[PDB]
RNA sequence: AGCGUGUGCCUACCCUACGCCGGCAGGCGCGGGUAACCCGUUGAACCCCAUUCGUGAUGGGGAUCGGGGAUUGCAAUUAUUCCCCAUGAACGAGGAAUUCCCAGUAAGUGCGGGUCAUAAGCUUGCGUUGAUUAAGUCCCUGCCCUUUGUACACACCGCCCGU
């Protein structure tokens, strides 16, 4: 079926991102996009904001692939 | 990153429906007569940020974009960018849009048909127009 | 309702010189005029002018025949009867004001439109 | 007159302005290094010209 | 990176550095090369590093058309070729069947030569990135040998019998 992903965060989805994503043990824009029904660009923006706030560690950054993890 | 309280999921511009979830640069290409290059140069001329969605724009920005799109020559857009340079009937440079393009193509075909030029006859018959071979290709759409 | 070619009506077109008409034409016609016309085109123009001068006030001019299929239709030709050779026969064409800028060969078709018959044995 | 019409068509370029230097044929012409021969005449005279088959 | 080409008996048609103009196709000047000497240290493309997009026939794909501009030609219409806006088709990996290939090979990616006034979706060469599988068999296809049968020798597309 058709895949309708949110392009701008809602209240419930923003709460989900702020509460559950920082505990995933493997954070990736594709993973967050598939779990939160979000587009890739919004997922990348949200992950960059979380990295700026310091709530998430970054493992490796590449144009093809960016890898995040929960804080120790 | 949260959606603004006033967000347009669907916009009505020039009798065309614009999807507010697409980025403004590619959203307005849904108008017939606007491509990626023309949309990008119009938006660069309107001093509008290209990192936002179409639904995030205010009414002032939308009307400014429409005004700049209607009259390119006023806003330093070059003649070579336009798609209707040097009109045959009146000789005026302009950019033709959704319905105007549809009737301008009709008039361009009618001119060739009435004068009975070869290209007009080919258009009337339904055959290829730019000298291509027809023996083996173009079968689709024919009985 | 009145005919205008890129905002210019027929009278001004007739008054203009070739240099002024070059800027109204398209790139191909402008290049052709810039390279100049040869003796045969001038002879055809002279014959057309001679034929149009001798026409009765209410009648059409006599048909002038030619093989020049690459001749550009100038504004001075409007209203003349030209037979254009298509390789087998001279097809009669009356120059209309909306033909300015085209070739003569565009108005005398060089082939018969195809009406298909039953395919033969050698078709599979 | 006839003097003007005869051979009037320009022949400064194209297939009609070039021919083999041995048999005067206009097809399959070799112009590399200024040979100006058709392929058959070249194959006939290659050893005399100095072209050897090594591979 | 590599292989190569470059001013021509007839024979008109060469490869181009640098400066300026144009947004681009291009236009003006002014120099080198008959060549390990000049183009040229041939700043090639895939590839590499970042940016944007986000499963939507979509910013995939680029067919078909409209309007303009420029180059080759004696001549461009039945669009020579090239450039710019606009338009945005089928196509979501392909039935029966079938081709080529064992290591710097297959495939991907560009560059020269031929044709060439204008000129490569073809061919002939050259590099660059670079594998999976196999070190066997006569099952399919085909071709060779040996034995064997023949009423065939125009040689099974043969010869030949009866209504
Ligand atoms: Mg559009
Ligand atoms: Mg053709
Ligand atoms: Mg067909
Ligand atoms: Mg599309
Ligand atoms: Mg598309
Ligand atoms: Mg055109
Ligand atoms: Mg034809
Ligand atoms: Mg385009
Ligand atoms: Mg090649
Ligand atoms: Mg070539
Ligand atoms: Mg061929
Ligand atoms: Mg076998
Ligand atoms: Mg036996
Ligand atoms: Mg025997
Ligand atoms: Zn020969």
Coordinates of C-alpha atoms (C1' of nucleotides) and ligand atoms in Angstrom, one line a residue:
Chain A
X1 CA 0.0 0.0 0.0
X2 CA 0.9 3.7 -0.2
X3 CA 3.4 5.0 2.4
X4 CA 2.3 8.4 3.9
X5 CA 5.0 9.8 6.1
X6 CA 4.8 13.0 8.1
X7 CA 6.9 15.8 6.8
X8 CA 6.6 18.0 9.9
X9 CA 6.5 16.8 13.5
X10 CA 3.2 16.6 15.5
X11 CA 2.8 16.7 19.2
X12 CA 2.5 12.9 19.7
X13 CA 5.4 12.2 17.2
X14 CA 7.6 14.8 18.8
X15 CA 7.0 13.3 22.2
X16 CA 7.8 9.8 20.8
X17 CA 11.0 11.1 19.4
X18 CA 12.1 12.9 22.6
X19 CA 11.1 9.9 24.8
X20 CA 11.9 6.6 23.0
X21 CA 14.5 7.3 20.3
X22 CA 17.4 8.1 22.7
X23 CA 17.0 4.5 24.1
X24 CA 17.1 2.5 20.8
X25 CA 20.7 1.3 21.1
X26 CA 20.9 1.9 17.3
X27 CA 19.6 5.2 15.9
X28 CA 19.6 5.8 12.1
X29 CA 17.4 8.1 10.0
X30 CA 16.0 5.1 8.2
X31 CA 15.2 3.4 11.5
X32 CA 13.5 6.4 13.0
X33 CA 11.7 7.1 9.7
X34 CA 10.3 3.5 9.6
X35 CA 9.3 3.4 13.3
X36 CA 7.9 7.0 13.6
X37 CA 6.3 7.1 10.2
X38 CA 8.5 10.1 9.3
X39 CA 10.3 11.1 6.1
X40 CA 14.0 10.8 5.8
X41 CA 14.7 14.5 5.8
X42 CA 12.7 15.2 8.9
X43 CA 14.4 12.2 10.6
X44 CA 17.8 13.5 9.7
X45 CA 16.9 17.0 11.0
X46 CA 15.6 15.6 14.3
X47 CA 18.7 13.4 14.7
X48 CA 20.9 16.4 14.1
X49 CA 19.0 18.4 16.7
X50 CA 19.3 15.6 19.2
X51 CA 23.0 15.4 18.6
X52 CA 23.4 19.1 19.1
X53 CA 21.5 18.9 22.4
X54 CA 24.0 16.1 23.4
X55 CA 21.3 13.4 24.1
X56 CA 22.8 11.0 21.6
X57 CA 26.3 9.8 20.7
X58 CA 27.5 9.7 17.1
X59 CA 29.5 6.7 15.9
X60 CA 30.3 7.4 12.3
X61 CA 29.2 10.0 9.8
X62 CA 29.1 9.3 6.0
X63 CA 27.1 10.7 3.1
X64 CA 25.6 7.3 2.5
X65 CA 25.1 6.4 6.2
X66 CA 25.0 8.1 9.6
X67 CA 25.1 6.0 12.8
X68 CA 23.9 7.1 16.2
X69 CA 23.7 5.4 19.6
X70 CA 22.3 6.1 23.1
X71 CA 24.4 7.7 25.8
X72 CA 26.4 5.4 28.0
Chain B
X1 CA 10.6 21.1 13.5
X2 CA 6.9 21.0 14.6
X3 CA 4.3 21.9 12.1
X4 CA 3.1 25.5 12.2
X5 CA -0.4 26.2 13.5
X6 CA -1.4 27.8 10.2
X7 CA -0.2 25.2 7.6
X8 CA -1.6 24.8 4.0
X9 CA -1.6 21.2 3.0
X10 CA -3.2 22.2 -0.3
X11 CA -2.7 25.5 -2.1
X12 CA -4.8 26.9 -5.0
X13 CA -2.5 28.8 -7.4
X14 CA -3.5 29.7 -10.9
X15 CA -6.3 27.1 -11.0
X16 CA -3.7 24.5 -10.0
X17 CA -3.4 22.4 -6.9
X18 CA -0.1 22.7 -5.1
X19 CA 0.9 20.0 -2.6
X20 CA 2.0 21.8 0.6
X21 CA 4.1 18.9 1.8
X22 CA 6.7 19.4 -1.0
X23 CA 9.5 21.9 -0.9
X24 CA 8.6 25.3 -2.3
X25 CA 11.1 25.0 -5.2
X26 CA 9.6 21.8 -6.6
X27 CA 6.0 22.3 -5.3
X28 CA 5.3 25.1 -7.8
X29 CA 6.5 23.1 -10.8
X30 CA 3.1 21.5 -10.7
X31 CA 2.0 24.6 -12.6
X32 CA 2.0 23.9 -16.4
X33 CA 4.7 26.2 -17.9
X34 CA 7.0 26.2 -14.8
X35 CA 10.1 23.9 -14.6
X36 CA 12.9 23.4 -12.1
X37 CA 15.0 26.2 -13.6
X38 CA 12.2 28.7 -13.9
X39 CA 10.9 27.9 -10.4
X40 CA 14.4 28.2 -8.9
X41 CA 15.1 31.6 -10.6
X42 CA 11.7 33.0 -9.6
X43 CA 12.2 31.9 -6.0
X44 CA 15.8 33.3 -6.0
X45 CA 14.3 36.6 -7.3
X46 CA 11.7 36.6 -4.6
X47 CA 14.3 36.4 -1.8
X48 CA 12.4 33.4 -0.3
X49 CA 14.3 30.7 1.6
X50 CA 14.4 27.4 -0.3
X51 CA 14.7 25.2 2.8
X52 CA 11.0 25.4 3.7
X53 CA 7.9 23.6 2.6
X54 CA 5.2 25.2 0.4
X55 CA 2.7 25.2 3.2
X56 CA 5.0 27.2 5.5
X57 CA 4.8 30.3 3.3
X58 CA 2.6 33.3 4.3
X59 CA 0.1 34.9 2.0
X60 CA 2.5 37.8 1.3
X61 CA 5.2 35.5 0.1
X62 CA 2.7 33.5 -2.1
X63 CA 1.3 36.6 -3.7
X64 CA 4.8 38.0 -4.2
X65 CA 5.9 34.8 -5.9
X66 CA 2.7 34.8 -8.1
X67 CA 3.4 38.5 -9.1
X68 CA 7.0 37.8 -9.9
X69 CA 6.0 34.7 -11.9
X70 CA 3.4 36.6 -14.0
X71 CA 5.8 39.4 -15.1
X72 CA 9.4 38.1 -15.3
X73 CA 10.7 41.0 -17.4
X74 CA 10.0 43.5 -14.6
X75 CA 12.2 41.6 -12.2
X76 CA 15.4 41.3 -14.3
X77 CA 14.6 37.8 -15.6
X78 CA 16.4 37.6 -19.0
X79 CA 14.6 37.1 -22.2
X80 CA 16.4 33.9 -23.1
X81 CA 14.9 32.3 -19.9
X82 CA 11.4 32.8 -21.2
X83 CA 9.6 30.0 -23.2
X84 CA 7.6 32.3 -25.5
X85 CA 10.3 34.7 -26.9
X86 CA 9.3 36.8 -29.9
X87 CA 5.7 35.9 -30.5
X88 CA 4.7 35.5 -34.1
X89 CA 1.4 37.5 -34.0
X90 CA 2.5 40.3 -31.7
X91 CA 6.2 40.1 -31.1
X92 CA 6.2 40.3 -27.3
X93 CA 8.4 38.3 -25.0
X94 CA 6.6 36.6 -22.1
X95 CA 6.3 33.3 -20.1
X96 CA 3.1 31.4 -20.8
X97 CA 1.4 29.4 -18.1
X98 CA -1.2 26.7 -17.4
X99 CA -4.2 27.6 -19.5
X100 CA -2.5 30.1 -21.7
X101 CA 0.0 27.5 -22.8
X102 CA -2.9 25.1 -23.6
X103 CA -4.5 27.6 -25.9
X104 CA -1.3 29.0 -27.3
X105 CA -0.3 25.5 -28.5
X106 CA -3.8 25.2 -30.0
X107 CA -3.3 28.5 -31.9
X108 CA 0.2 27.4 -33.0
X109 CA -1.3 24.2 -34.5
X110 CA -4.2 26.0 -36.1
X111 CA -1.9 28.4 -37.8
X112 CA 0.0 25.6 -39.5
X113 CA -3.1 23.6 -40.3
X114 CA -4.9 26.6 -42.0
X115 CA -1.9 27.6 -44.1
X116 CA -1.5 23.9 -45.2
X117 CA 2.1 23.6 -44.4
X118 CA 3.7 20.2 -44.3
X119 CA 4.1 20.2 -40.5
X120 CA 0.5 21.2 -40.0
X121 CA -0.6 18.3 -42.2
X122 CA 1.6 15.9 -40.3
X123 CA 0.0 17.1 -37.0
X124 CA -3.5 16.8 -38.5
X125 CA -2.8 13.2 -39.7
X126 CA -1.2 12.2 -36.4
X127 CA 2.2 11.2 -37.7
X128 CA 5.7 12.2 -36.6
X129 CA 6.7 15.8 -37.2
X130 CA 10.5 16.1 -36.9
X131 CA 11.6 13.8 -39.6
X132 CA 11.9 10.6 -37.7
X133 CA 11.6 7.1 -39.3
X134 CA 8.1 5.6 -38.9
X135 CA 8.7 2.2 -40.4
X136 CA 9.6 0.3 -37.2
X137 CA 8.8 2.6 -34.3
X138 CA 5.8 4.6 -33.0
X139 CA 3.5 1.6 -33.4
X140 CA 2.0 2.3 -30.0
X141 CA -1.3 4.1 -30.2
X142 CA -2.1 2.8 -33.7
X143 CA -4.5 0.0 -34.5
Chain C
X1 CA -8.4 41.0 -37.2
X2 CA -5.8 42.9 -39.2
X3 CA -2.7 40.8 -40.1
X4 CA 0.4 41.7 -38.1
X5 CA 3.7 39.8 -38.3
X6 CA 5.4 40.2 -34.9
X7 CA 3.5 43.4 -34.3
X8 CA 4.1 44.8 -37.8
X9 CA 1.3 45.0 -40.4
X10 CA 1.7 44.3 -44.1
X11 CA 2.2 47.9 -45.3
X12 CA 5.2 48.5 -43.0
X13 CA 6.6 45.2 -44.0
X14 CA 6.4 46.2 -47.6
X15 CA 8.1 49.5 -46.8
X16 CA 10.9 47.9 -44.8
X17 CA 14.3 47.0 -46.4
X18 CA 15.9 43.6 -46.1
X19 CA 18.0 44.7 -43.1
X20 CA 14.9 45.6 -41.1
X21 CA 13.2 42.3 -42.2
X22 CA 16.3 40.3 -41.0
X23 CA 15.5 41.2 -37.4
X24 CA 11.9 40.1 -37.7
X25 CA 12.7 36.7 -39.2
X26 CA 14.0 33.7 -37.3
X27 CA 17.6 32.5 -37.1
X28 CA 17.5 30.4 -40.3
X29 CA 15.9 33.1 -42.5
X30 CA 18.1 35.8 -41.0
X31 CA 21.2 33.7 -41.8
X32 CA 19.9 33.0 -45.3
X33 CA 19.3 36.7 -46.0
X34 CA 22.7 37.6 -44.5
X35 CA 24.4 35.2 -46.9
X36 CA 22.5 36.8 -49.7
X37 CA 20.2 35.7 -52.5
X38 CA 21.6 34.5 -55.8
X39 CA 20.6 35.3 -59.4
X40 CA 17.8 32.7 -59.7
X41 CA 15.9 34.0 -56.7
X42 CA 16.1 37.6 -58.1
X43 CA 14.9 36.4 -61.5
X44 CA 11.9 34.7 -59.8
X45 CA 11.1 37.8 -57.8
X46 CA 11.3 39.9 -61.0
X47 CA 9.0 37.5 -62.9
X48 CA 6.5 37.6 -60.0
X49 CA 6.6 41.4 -59.9
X50 CA 6.1 41.5 -63.7
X51 CA 3.2 39.1 -63.5
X52 CA 1.5 41.0 -60.6
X53 CA 1.8 44.3 -62.4
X54 CA -0.1 43.1 -65.5
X55 CA -3.0 41.6 -63.5
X56 CA -6.5 43.2 -64.1
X57 CA -7.7 45.3 -61.2
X58 CA -10.2 42.6 -60.1
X59 CA -8.4 39.5 -61.3
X60 CA -5.6 37.3 -59.9
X61 CA -2.1 37.4 -61.5
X62 CA -0.9 34.8 -63.9
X63 CA 0.7 31.7 -62.4
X64 CA 4.5 31.7 -62.4
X65 CA 6.2 28.2 -62.3
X66 CA 9.4 27.4 -60.6
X67 CA 11.7 24.6 -59.3
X68 CA 12.9 26.8 -56.4
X69 CA 11.7 24.8 -53.4
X70 CA 14.1 26.6 -51.0
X71 CA 12.9 30.1 -51.7
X72 CA 11.9 32.1 -48.7
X73 CA 8.5 33.8 -48.8
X74 CA 9.1 37.5 -48.6
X75 CA 6.4 40.0 -47.8
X76 CA 6.4 41.2 -51.4
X77 CA 5.2 37.8 -52.7
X78 CA 1.8 38.0 -50.9
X79 CA -1.0 37.7 -53.4
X80 CA 0.9 35.9 -56.2
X81 CA 0.2 32.5 -57.8
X82 CA 3.3 30.3 -57.8
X83 CA 3.5 26.8 -59.3
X84 CA 6.1 24.9 -57.2
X85 CA 7.7 21.8 -58.7
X86 CA 7.5 18.7 -56.5
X87 CA 9.6 16.5 -58.8
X88 CA 6.7 15.4 -61.0
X89 CA 4.1 18.2 -61.2
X90 CA 3.8 21.9 -60.5
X91 CA 1.4 22.5 -57.6
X92 CA -0.4 25.8 -57.6
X93 CA -0.1 27.8 -54.4
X94 CA -1.5 31.3 -53.6
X95 CA 0.7 33.2 -51.2
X96 CA -1.1 34.2 -48.1
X97 CA 0.2 36.8 -45.6
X98 CA 0.5 34.0 -42.9
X99 CA 3.2 32.3 -45.1
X100 CA 5.9 34.9 -44.5
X101 CA 9.1 33.2 -43.4
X102 CA 8.4 29.7 -44.6
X103 CA 9.8 28.0 -47.7
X104 CA 7.9 27.4 -50.9
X105 CA 8.6 23.6 -50.7
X106 CA 6.6 23.4 -47.5
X107 CA 3.4 23.9 -49.5
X108 CA 3.8 21.4 -52.3
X109 CA 4.0 17.9 -50.8
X110 CA 6.5 15.6 -52.4
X111 CA 4.8 12.2 -51.7
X112 CA 1.4 10.6 -51.7
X113 CA -0.1 9.9 -48.2
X114 CA -0.1 6.2 -47.5
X115 CA -3.3 4.2 -47.5
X116 CA -2.4 0.7 -46.4
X117 CA -3.6 -2.5 -48.1
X118 CA -3.8 -6.1 -47.0
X119 CA -0.3 -7.4 -46.0
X120 CA 1.2 -9.9 -48.4
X121 CA 2.4 -13.4 -47.9
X122 CA 5.9 -12.3 -47.0
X123 CA 4.7 -10.7 -43.8
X124 CA 4.5 -12.9 -40.7
Chain D
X1 CA 24.8 28.8 -72.6
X2 CA 26.0 25.3 -72.4
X3 CA 29.5 26.3 -71.3
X4 CA 28.1 27.7 -68.0
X5 CA 25.7 24.8 -67.3
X6 CA 28.1 22.0 -68.0
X7 CA 29.9 20.8 -64.8
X8 CA 28.5 23.8 -63.0
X9 CA 27.6 22.0 -59.8
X10 CA 30.3 22.7 -57.1
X11 CA 32.4 19.7 -56.1
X12 CA 34.6 21.1 -53.4
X13 CA 33.5 18.6 -50.7
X14 CA 31.7 15.3 -50.4
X15 CA 31.9 11.9 -52.0
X16 CA 31.7 13.4 -55.5
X17 CA 35.0 15.3 -55.0
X18 CA 37.1 12.2 -54.1
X19 CA 37.9 9.0 -55.9
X20 CA 40.5 6.2 -55.9
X21 CA 43.8 7.0 -57.5
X22 CA 44.0 3.6 -59.2
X23 CA 40.5 2.7 -60.4
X24 CA 38.6 6.0 -60.0
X25 CA 36.0 4.5 -57.6
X26 CA 34.3 6.6 -55.0
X27 CA 33.3 3.9 -52.5
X28 CA 35.4 2.5 -49.6
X29 CA 38.0 5.2 -49.9
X30 CA 41.0 5.3 -47.6
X31 CA 42.2 8.9 -46.8
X32 CA 44.5 8.2 -43.8
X33 CA 48.1 9.4 -44.4
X34 CA 46.9 10.6 -47.8
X35 CA 46.6 7.2 -49.4
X36 CA 43.5 8.1 -51.5
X37 CA 42.8 4.4 -52.5
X38 CA 39.8 2.2 -52.2
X39 CA 40.2 -0.7 -49.8
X40 CA 40.5 -3.3 -52.5
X41 CA 43.3 -1.5 -54.4
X42 CA 45.0 -0.9 -51.0
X43 CA 44.9 -4.6 -50.2
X44 CA 46.3 -5.3 -53.6
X45 CA 49.2 -2.9 -53.3
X46 CA 49.9 -2.9 -49.5
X47 CA 53.1 -5.0 -49.8
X48 CA 54.5 -2.7 -52.5
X49 CA 53.6 0.4 -50.4
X50 CA 55.3 -1.1 -47.3
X51 CA 52.5 -2.2 -44.9
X52 CA 53.3 -5.6 -43.3
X53 CA 50.9 -7.9 -41.4
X54 CA 52.4 -8.6 -38.0
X55 CA 49.2 -9.3 -36.1
Chain E
rA1 C1' 45.6 7.0 -17.9
rG2 C1' 46.8 4.6 -22.5
rC3 C1' 46.6 3.7 -27.8
rG4 C1' 46.8 7.4 -31.5
rU5 C1' 45.8 11.9 -35.0
rG6 C1' 47.2 16.8 -36.7
rU7 C1' 48.3 22.5 -41.9
rG8 C1' 46.6 17.4 -47.9
rC9 C1' 49.6 16.4 -56.3
rC10 C1' 44.4 16.8 -58.2
rU11 C1' 42.0 18.8 -53.2
rA12 C1' 38.6 23.2 -51.6
rC13 C1' 38.7 20.8 -46.0
rC14 C1' 44.4 20.5 -40.0
rC15 C1' 45.3 20.1 -34.2
rU16 C1' 44.8 24.1 -31.1
rA17 C1' 47.4 27.4 -26.4
rC18 C1' 46.4 32.7 -24.6
rG19 C1' 43.5 37.7 -24.3
rC20 C1' 38.5 40.1 -24.9
rC21 C1' 32.9 39.8 -25.8
rG22 C1' 28.3 36.5 -24.7
rG23 C1' 24.5 33.3 -19.8
rC24 C1' 25.2 29.0 -23.7
rA25 C1' 25.8 27.2 -28.2
rG26 C1' 29.5 30.7 -30.3
rG27 C1' 32.2 35.4 -32.3
rC28 C1' 36.5 38.4 -32.5
rG29 C1' 41.9 39.1 -32.1
rC30 C1' 46.9 37.3 -31.7
rG31 C1' 50.7 32.9 -31.4
rG32 C1' 52.8 27.4 -31.7
rG33 C1' 53.1 22.9 -34.4
rU34 C1' 54.9 19.2 -41.1
rA35 C1' 55.6 17.3 -34.5
rA36 C1' 59.4 12.9 -27.7
rC37 C1' 59.8 20.2 -29.7
rC38 C1' 52.9 22.8 -30.0
rC39 C1' 47.9 21.5 -28.3
rG40 C1' 50.0 18.4 -23.7
rU41 C1' 52.3 17.2 -17.3
rU42 C1' 46.8 14.9 -22.9
rG43 C1' 43.9 18.2 -14.9
rA44 C1' 39.0 11.7 -19.0
rA45 C1' 34.8 9.2 -17.0
rC46 C1' 33.6 5.8 -13.6
rC47 C1' 35.6 6.2 -8.5
rC48 C1' 36.4 9.4 -3.7
rC49 C1' 34.5 13.4 0.1
rA50 C1' 30.5 16.6 1.5
rU51 C1' 25.1 18.8 0.3
rU52 C1' 19.8 18.2 -1.0
rC53 C1' 15.8 14.4 -1.9
rG54 C1' 13.1 10.1 0.7
rU55 C1' 9.6 4.7 -1.8
rG56 C1' 5.6 8.9 -4.2
rA57 C1' 5.7 6.8 -12.2
rU58 C1' 9.1 10.7 -7.2
rG59 C1' 14.1 15.7 -7.9
rG60 C1' 13.7 7.9 -11.3
rG61 C1' 13.2 7.9 -17.1
rG62 C1' 13.5 11.3 -21.1
rA63 C1' 10.1 9.8 -25.6
rU64 C1' 6.9 13.3 -28.2
rC65 C1' 5.9 18.3 -29.1
rG66 C1' 5.9 24.5 -28.9
rG67 C1' 8.8 29.1 -29.1
rG68 C1' 13.5 31.3 -29.6
rG69 C1' 19.4 31.6 -30.8
rA70 C1' 23.9 29.9 -33.4
rU71 C1' 27.3 27.2 -36.6
rU72 C1' 28.5 23.8 -41.9
rG73 C1' 27.3 24.6 -46.5
rC74 C1' 25.6 26.9 -53.2
rA75 C1' 21.2 25.1 -50.8
rA76 C1' 18.9 22.8 -43.9
rU77 C1' 11.5 22.3 -45.6
rU78 C1' 10.5 15.9 -45.0
rA79 C1' 13.3 19.2 -38.6
rU80 C1' 22.2 18.4 -40.9
rU81 C1' 24.3 19.4 -36.3
rC82 C1' 24.5 22.4 -31.7
rC83 C1' 22.4 25.7 -27.5
rC84 C1' 18.3 27.9 -24.1
rC85 C1' 13.2 28.0 -21.8
rA86 C1' 8.8 25.1 -21.8
rU87 C1' 6.1 19.8 -22.3
rG88 C1' 6.9 15.3 -19.5
rA89 C1' 4.9 9.1 -22.8
rA90 C1' 5.7 3.8 -22.1
rC91 C1' 8.8 1.7 -18.5
rG92 C1' 8.2 -0.8 -11.2
rA93 C1' 13.3 -6.2 -14.0
rG94 C1' 10.4 -8.6 -18.5
rG95 C1' 6.5 -15.5 -21.4
rA96 C1' 7.9 -19.6 -24.7
rA97 C1' 12.7 -19.4 -26.4
rU98 C1' 17.8 -18.0 -26.7
rU99 C1' 23.6 -15.6 -26.8
rC100 C1' 28.7 -14.8 -25.0
rC101 C1' 32.3 -16.0 -21.5
rC102 C1' 37.5 -19.3 -17.3
rA103 C1' 41.9 -13.8 -14.9
rG104 C1' 43.7 -8.4 -15.3
rU105 C1' 38.9 -12.4 -18.0
rA106 C1' 33.3 -11.1 -17.7
rA107 C1' 31.0 -6.7 -16.6
rG108 C1' 31.0 -1.0 -15.4
rU109 C1' 33.5 3.7 -17.3
rG110 C1' 35.3 7.0 -20.4
rC111 C1' 39.2 8.2 -24.6
rG112 C1' 41.4 7.8 -29.8
rG113 C1' 41.1 6.0 -35.3
rG114 C1' 37.6 4.9 -39.8
rU115 C1' 33.6 7.2 -42.2
rC116 C1' 33.7 13.3 -41.6
rA117 C1' 32.2 20.7 -45.4
rU118 C1' 28.5 19.4 -41.3
rA119 C1' 29.2 13.9 -38.0
rA120 C1' 28.5 8.3 -33.9
rG121 C1' 23.3 5.0 -30.7
rC122 C1' 28.2 1.4 -35.7
rU123 C1' 32.9 -0.6 -36.1
rU124 C1' 38.1 -1.0 -34.9
rG125 C1' 41.6 -0.1 -30.9
rC126 C1' 43.2 2.0 -25.8
rG127 C1' 43.4 2.4 -21.0
rU128 C1' 40.8 2.7 -15.7
rU129 C1' 37.7 -0.2 -11.6
rG130 C1' 37.5 -5.1 -11.3
rA131 C1' 34.6 -10.2 -9.7
rU132 C1' 31.2 -14.9 -8.8
rU133 C1' 31.9 -19.8 -10.5
rA134 C1' 35.1 -24.3 -12.7
rA135 C1' 40.4 -27.4 -13.2
rG136 C1' 35.0 -31.8 -15.2
rU137 C1' 31.8 -34.7 -18.7
rC138 C1' 29.7 -36.9 -23.1
rC139 C1' 23.5 -35.7 -20.8
rC140 C1' 22.0 -31.8 -25.0
rU141 C1' 24.3 -29.8 -29.8
rG142 C1' 27.9 -30.6 -33.3
rC143 C1' 32.2 -32.7 -35.5
rC144 C1' 35.8 -36.7 -35.8
rC145 C1' 37.6 -42.0 -35.5
rU146 C1' 36.8 -48.0 -35.2
rU147 C1' 33.5 -52.0 -36.0
rU148 C1' 29.1 -53.2 -38.5
rG149 C1' 24.5 -53.4 -42.4
rU150 C1' 23.1 -51.6 -47.3
rA151 C1' 18.8 -53.3 -53.1
rC152 C1' 22.3 -46.0 -51.8
rA153 C1' 26.9 -44.1 -55.8
rC154 C1' 23.0 -37.4 -58.9
rA155 C1' 25.2 -41.2 -52.7
rC156 C1' 18.4 -40.9 -47.5
rC157 C1' 16.5 -34.4 -50.4
rG158 C1' 18.4 -41.8 -52.2
rC159 C1' 16.1 -46.0 -53.9
rC160 C1' 11.5 -48.2 -54.3
rC161 C1' 6.0 -51.0 -54.0
rG162 C1' 0.8 -51.2 -54.8
rU163 C1' -4.2 -49.1 -55.5
Ligands
LIG1 MG1 5.6 22.0 -14.7
LIG2 MG1 15.3 11.8 -40.6
LIG3 MG1 4.9 4.0 -37.1
LIG4 MG1 8.1 12.5 -13.2
LIG5 MG1 10.3 13.1 -13.4
LIG6 MG1 11.7 26.0 -34.6
LIG7 MG1 11.4 12.2 -47.9
LIG8 MG1 14.6 20.7 -20.3
LIG9 MG1 34.6 3.8 -29.6
LIG10 MG1 34.4 11.3 -35.3
LIG11 MG1 28.0 1.6 -40.6
LIG12 MG1 27.9 -36.1 -26.9
LIG13 MG1 20.7 -56.2 -42.4
LIG14 MG1 30.4 -51.1 -48.6
LIG15 ZN1 40.7 1.4 -56.4

